[PDB]
CSV table of all heavy atoms in Angstrom, one decimal:
chain,number,residue,atom,x,y,z
A,1,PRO,N,0.8,-1.3,0.0
A,1,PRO,CA,0.0,0.0,0.0
A,1,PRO,C,0.8,1.3,0.0
A,1,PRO,O,1.8,1.5,0.7
A,1,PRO,CB,-0.8,-0.2,1.3
A,1,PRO,CG,-1.1,-1.6,1.4
A,1,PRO,CD,0.2,-2.2,1.0
A,2,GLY,N,0.4,2.2,-0.9
A,2,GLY,CA,1.0,3.5,-1.0
A,2,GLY,C,2.3,3.7,-1.7
A,2,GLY,O,2.9,4.7,-1.8
A,3,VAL,N,2.8,2.6,-2.3
A,3,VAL,CA,4.1,2.6,-3.0
A,3,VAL,C,3.8,2.5,-4.4
A,3,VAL,O,2.9,1.7,-4.8
A,3,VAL,CB,5.0,1.4,-2.5
A,3,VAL,CG1,6.3,1.3,-3.2
A,3,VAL,CG2,5.3,1.7,-1.0
A,4,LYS,N,4.6,3.0,-5.3
A,4,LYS,CA,4.4,2.9,-6.7
A,4,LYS,C,5.1,1.7,-7.3
A,4,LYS,O,6.1,1.2,-6.8
A,4,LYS,CB,4.9,4.2,-7.4
A,4,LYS,CG,4.1,5.5,-7.1
A,4,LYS,CD,2.7,5.3,-7.5
A,4,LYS,CE,1.8,6.6,-7.4
A,4,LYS,NZ,0.4,6.5,-7.8
A,5,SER,N,4.6,1.2,-8.5
A,5,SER,CA,5.2,0.3,-9.4
A,5,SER,C,6.5,0.7,-9.9
A,5,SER,O,6.7,1.9,-10.1
A,5,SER,CB,4.3,0.1,-10.6
A,5,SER,OG,3.2,-0.7,-10.3
A,6,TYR,N,7.4,-0.3,-10.1
A,6,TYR,CA,8.6,-0.1,-10.8
A,6,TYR,C,8.3,0.6,-12.1
A,6,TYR,O,7.4,0.2,-12.8
A,6,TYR,CB,9.3,-1.4,-11.1
A,6,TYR,CG,10.8,-1.1,-11.3
A,6,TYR,CD1,11.6,-0.7,-10.3
A,6,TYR,CD2,11.3,-1.1,-12.6
A,6,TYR,CE1,12.9,-0.4,-10.5
A,6,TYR,CE2,12.6,-0.8,-12.8
A,6,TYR,CZ,13.4,-0.4,-11.7
A,6,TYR,OH,14.7,0.0,-11.9
A,7,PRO,N,9.1,1.5,-12.6
A,7,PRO,CA,10.4,2.2,-12.1
A,7,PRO,C,10.2,3.3,-11.1
A,7,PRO,O,11.1,3.9,-10.6
A,7,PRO,CB,11.0,2.8,-13.3
A,7,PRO,CG,9.7,3.1,-14.2
A,7,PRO,CD,8.8,2.0,-13.9
A,8,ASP,N,8.9,3.6,-10.7
A,8,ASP,CA,8.7,4.8,-9.8
A,8,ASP,C,8.7,4.4,-8.4
A,8,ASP,O,8.8,5.3,-7.6
A,8,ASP,CB,7.5,5.5,-10.3
A,8,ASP,CG,7.6,6.0,-11.7
A,8,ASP,OD1,8.7,6.6,-12.1
A,8,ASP,OD2,6.7,5.6,-12.5
A,9,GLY,N,8.6,3.1,-8.1
A,9,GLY,CA,8.8,2.7,-6.7
A,9,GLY,C,9.2,1.2,-6.8
A,9,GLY,O,9.6,0.7,-7.8
A,10,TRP,N,8.9,0.5,-5.7
A,10,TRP,CA,9.5,-0.9,-5.6
A,10,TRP,C,8.4,-1.9,-5.6
A,10,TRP,O,8.6,-3.1,-5.4
A,10,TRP,CB,10.3,-1.1,-4.3
A,10,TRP,CG,9.8,-0.5,-3.0
A,10,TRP,CD1,10.0,0.8,-2.5
A,10,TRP,CD2,9.0,-1.2,-2.1
A,10,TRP,NE1,9.3,0.9,-1.3
A,10,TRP,CE2,8.7,-0.3,-1.0
A,10,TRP,CE3,8.5,-2.5,-2.0
A,10,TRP,CZ2,7.9,-0.7,0.2
A,10,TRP,CZ3,7.7,-2.9,-0.8
A,10,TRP,CH2,7.4,-1.9,0.2
A,11,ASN,N,7.2,-1.6,-6.1
A,11,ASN,CA,6.2,-2.5,-6.3
A,11,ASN,C,6.2,-3.3,-7.5
A,11,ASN,O,6.9,-2.8,-8.5
A,11,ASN,CB,4.8,-1.9,-6.1
A,11,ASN,CG,4.2,-2.0,-4.7
A,11,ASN,OD1,4.7,-2.8,-3.9
A,11,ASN,ND2,3.2,-1.2,-4.4
A,12,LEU,N,5.5,-4.4,-7.6
A,12,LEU,CA,5.3,-5.2,-8.8
A,12,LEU,C,4.2,-4.6,-9.7
A,12,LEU,O,3.1,-4.5,-9.3
A,12,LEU,CB,4.9,-6.6,-8.5
A,12,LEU,CG,4.8,-7.6,-9.6
A,12,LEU,CD1,6.2,-8.0,-10.2
A,12,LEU,CD2,4.2,-8.9,-9.1
A,13,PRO,N,4.5,-4.3,-11.0
A,13,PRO,CA,3.6,-3.9,-12.0
A,13,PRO,C,2.7,-5.0,-12.5
A,13,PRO,O,3.2,-6.2,-12.3
A,13,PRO,CB,4.4,-3.4,-13.2
A,13,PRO,CG,5.9,-3.6,-12.8
A,13,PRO,CD,5.9,-4.3,-11.5
A,14,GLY,N,1.6,-4.8,-13.2
A,14,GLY,CA,0.7,-5.9,-13.6
A,14,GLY,C,1.2,-6.8,-14.6
A,14,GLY,O,0.6,-7.9,-14.8
A,15,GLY,N,2.2,-6.4,-15.3
A,15,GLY,CA,2.9,-7.1,-16.3
A,15,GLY,C,4.1,-7.9,-15.7
A,15,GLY,O,4.7,-8.7,-16.5
A,16,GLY,N,4.5,-7.7,-14.5
A,16,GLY,CA,5.6,-8.3,-13.8
A,16,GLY,C,5.2,-9.8,-13.5
A,16,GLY,O,4.1,-10.1,-13.2
A,17,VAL,N,6.3,-10.7,-13.6
A,17,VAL,CA,6.0,-12.0,-13.3
A,17,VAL,C,7.3,-12.6,-12.5
A,17,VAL,O,8.4,-12.3,-12.9
A,17,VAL,CB,5.9,-12.8,-14.6
A,17,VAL,CG1,5.5,-14.3,-14.3
A,17,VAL,CG2,4.9,-12.2,-15.6
A,18,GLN,N,7.0,-13.5,-11.6
A,18,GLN,CA,8.0,-14.2,-10.8
A,18,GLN,C,8.3,-15.5,-11.4
A,18,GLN,O,7.5,-16.4,-11.6
A,18,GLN,CB,7.3,-14.5,-9.4
A,18,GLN,CG,8.3,-15.1,-8.4
A,18,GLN,CD,7.6,-15.8,-7.2
A,18,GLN,OE1,7.9,-16.9,-6.8
A,18,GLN,NE2,6.6,-15.1,-6.6
A,19,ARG,N,9.6,-15.6,-11.9
A,19,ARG,CA,10.2,-16.8,-12.3
A,19,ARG,C,10.5,-17.7,-11.1
A,19,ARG,O,10.5,-17.3,-9.9
A,19,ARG,CB,11.4,-16.6,-13.1
A,19,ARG,CG,11.3,-16.0,-14.5
A,19,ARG,CD,12.5,-15.2,-14.9
A,19,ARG,NE,12.3,-14.4,-16.1
A,19,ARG,CZ,11.6,-13.2,-16.1
A,19,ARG,NH1,11.1,-12.7,-14.9
A,19,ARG,NH2,11.5,-12.5,-17.2
A,20,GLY,N,10.7,-19.0,-11.4
A,20,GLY,CA,11.2,-19.9,-10.3
A,20,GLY,C,11.0,-21.4,-10.6
A,20,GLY,O,10.0,-21.8,-11.3
A,21,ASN,N,11.9,-22.2,-10.2
A,21,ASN,CA,11.7,-23.7,-10.4
A,21,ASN,C,10.7,-24.2,-9.5
A,21,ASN,O,10.3,-23.6,-8.5
A,21,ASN,CB,13.1,-24.4,-10.1
A,21,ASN,CG,13.4,-24.7,-8.6
A,21,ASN,OD1,12.7,-25.6,-8.1
A,21,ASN,ND2,14.3,-24.1,-8.0
A,22,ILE,N,10.1,-25.3,-9.9
A,22,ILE,CA,9.0,-26.0,-9.3
A,22,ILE,C,9.3,-27.5,-8.9
A,22,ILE,O,8.4,-28.3,-8.9
A,22,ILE,CB,7.7,-25.9,-10.2
A,22,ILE,CG1,8.0,-26.3,-11.6
A,22,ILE,CG2,7.1,-24.5,-10.1
A,22,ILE,CD1,6.8,-26.7,-12.3
A,23,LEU,N,10.5,-27.7,-8.6
A,23,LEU,CA,11.0,-29.0,-8.2
A,23,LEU,C,10.7,-29.4,-6.8
A,23,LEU,O,10.5,-28.5,-6.0
A,23,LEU,CB,12.5,-29.1,-8.3
A,23,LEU,CG,13.1,-29.0,-9.7
A,23,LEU,CD1,14.6,-28.9,-9.6
A,23,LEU,CD2,12.7,-30.1,-10.7
A,24,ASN,N,10.6,-30.7,-6.5
A,24,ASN,CA,10.6,-31.2,-5.1
A,24,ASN,C,11.8,-32.1,-4.9
A,24,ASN,O,11.6,-33.4,-5.0
A,24,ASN,CB,9.3,-31.9,-4.8
A,24,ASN,CG,8.1,-30.9,-4.6
A,24,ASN,OD1,7.9,-30.2,-3.6
A,24,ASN,ND2,7.5,-30.5,-5.8
A,25,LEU,N,13.0,-31.6,-4.8
A,25,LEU,CA,14.2,-32.3,-4.7
A,25,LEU,C,14.4,-33.0,-3.4
A,25,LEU,O,15.2,-33.9,-3.3
A,25,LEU,CB,15.4,-31.4,-5.0
A,25,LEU,CG,15.5,-30.9,-6.5
A,25,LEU,CD1,16.7,-29.9,-6.7
A,25,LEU,CD2,15.7,-32.1,-7.4
A,26,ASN,N,13.9,-32.4,-2.3
A,26,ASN,CA,14.2,-32.8,-0.9
A,26,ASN,C,15.7,-33.0,-0.6
A,26,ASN,O,16.1,-34.0,0.0
A,26,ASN,CB,13.5,-34.1,-0.7
A,26,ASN,CG,12.0,-33.9,-0.7
A,26,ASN,OD1,11.4,-32.8,-0.2
A,26,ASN,ND2,11.3,-34.8,-1.2
A,27,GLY,N,16.5,-32.0,-1.1
A,27,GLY,CA,17.9,-32.1,-0.9
A,27,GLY,C,18.8,-32.8,-1.9
A,27,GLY,O,20.0,-32.9,-1.7
A,28,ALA,N,18.3,-33.4,-3.0
A,28,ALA,CA,18.9,-34.3,-3.9
A,28,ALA,C,20.0,-33.6,-4.7
A,28,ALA,O,21.0,-34.3,-5.1
A,28,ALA,CB,18.0,-35.1,-4.7
A,29,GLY,N,19.9,-32.3,-5.0
A,29,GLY,CA,20.7,-31.7,-6.0
A,29,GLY,C,20.3,-32.0,-7.4
A,29,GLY,O,19.0,-32.1,-7.7
A,30,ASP,N,21.2,-32.1,-8.3
A,30,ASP,CA,20.9,-32.5,-9.8
A,30,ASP,C,19.9,-33.7,-9.9
A,30,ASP,O,20.2,-34.7,-9.3
A,30,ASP,CB,22.2,-32.9,-10.5
A,30,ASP,CG,22.0,-33.5,-11.8
A,30,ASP,OD1,21.1,-33.0,-12.6
A,30,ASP,OD2,22.7,-34.5,-12.2
A,31,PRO,N,18.8,-33.5,-10.5
A,31,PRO,CA,17.8,-34.5,-10.6
A,31,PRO,C,18.3,-35.8,-11.0
A,31,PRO,O,17.7,-36.9,-10.7
A,31,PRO,CB,16.8,-33.9,-11.6
A,31,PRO,CG,16.8,-32.5,-11.3
A,31,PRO,CD,18.3,-32.2,-11.1
A,32,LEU,N,19.4,-35.8,-11.8
A,32,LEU,CA,19.8,-37.0,-12.4
A,32,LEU,C,20.9,-37.8,-11.7
A,32,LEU,O,21.2,-39.0,-12.1
A,32,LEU,CB,20.4,-36.7,-13.8
A,32,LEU,CG,19.4,-36.1,-14.8
A,32,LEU,CD1,20.0,-36.0,-16.2
A,32,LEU,CD2,18.0,-36.8,-14.9
A,33,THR,N,21.5,-37.3,-10.7
A,33,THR,CA,22.7,-37.9,-10.1
A,33,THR,C,22.7,-37.8,-8.5
A,33,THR,O,23.6,-37.5,-7.8
A,33,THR,CB,24.0,-37.1,-10.5
A,33,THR,OG1,23.9,-35.7,-10.1
A,33,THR,CG2,24.2,-37.3,-11.9
A,34,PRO,N,21.5,-38.2,-7.9
A,34,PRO,CA,21.4,-38.1,-6.4
A,34,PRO,C,22.4,-38.9,-5.7
A,34,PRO,O,22.6,-40.1,-6.0
A,34,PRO,CB,20.0,-38.7,-6.1
A,34,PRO,CG,19.6,-39.4,-7.4
A,34,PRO,CD,20.3,-38.7,-8.5
A,35,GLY,N,23.2,-38.3,-4.9
A,35,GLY,CA,24.2,-38.9,-4.1
A,35,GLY,C,25.6,-38.7,-4.5
A,35,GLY,O,26.5,-38.9,-3.7
A,36,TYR,N,25.8,-38.3,-5.8
A,36,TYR,CA,27.2,-38.3,-6.4
A,36,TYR,C,27.3,-37.1,-7.2
A,36,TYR,O,26.4,-36.6,-7.8
A,36,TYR,CB,27.3,-39.6,-7.2
A,36,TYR,CG,27.0,-40.8,-6.4
A,36,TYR,CD1,25.8,-41.5,-6.4
A,36,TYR,CD2,27.9,-41.3,-5.5
A,36,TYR,CE1,25.5,-42.5,-5.6
A,36,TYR,CE2,27.6,-42.5,-4.7
A,36,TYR,CZ,26.4,-43.0,-4.8
A,36,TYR,OH,26.0,-44.1,-3.9
A,37,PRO,N,28.5,-36.6,-7.4
A,37,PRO,CA,28.7,-35.4,-8.2
A,37,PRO,C,28.5,-35.7,-9.7
A,37,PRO,O,28.9,-36.7,-10.2
A,37,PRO,CB,30.1,-34.9,-7.9
A,37,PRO,CG,30.8,-36.2,-7.6
A,37,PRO,CD,29.8,-37.0,-6.8
A,38,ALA,N,27.8,-34.7,-10.4
A,38,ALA,CA,27.6,-34.8,-11.8
A,38,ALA,C,28.8,-34.5,-12.6
A,38,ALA,O,29.0,-33.4,-13.3
A,38,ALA,CB,26.4,-33.8,-12.1
């Protein structure tokens, strides 16, 4: 509340989107090599 959208403040504009992975690795690291370095 009360803050403007980027570039005029630090809010998210309506065209802004949050990237990010959607994995459930539970600590595994590389999906293909659990336990051992790739």
Side-chain angles (χ1 to χ4, degrees):
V3 173
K4 292 302 185 179
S5 280
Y6 201 72
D8 301 313
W10 48 266
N11 267 341
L12 189 65
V17 186
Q18 185 196 134
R19 288 155 192 76
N21 86 70
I22 49 156
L23 297 172
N24 289 275
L25 286 176
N26 293 325
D30 173 35
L32 302 185
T33 59
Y36 305 100

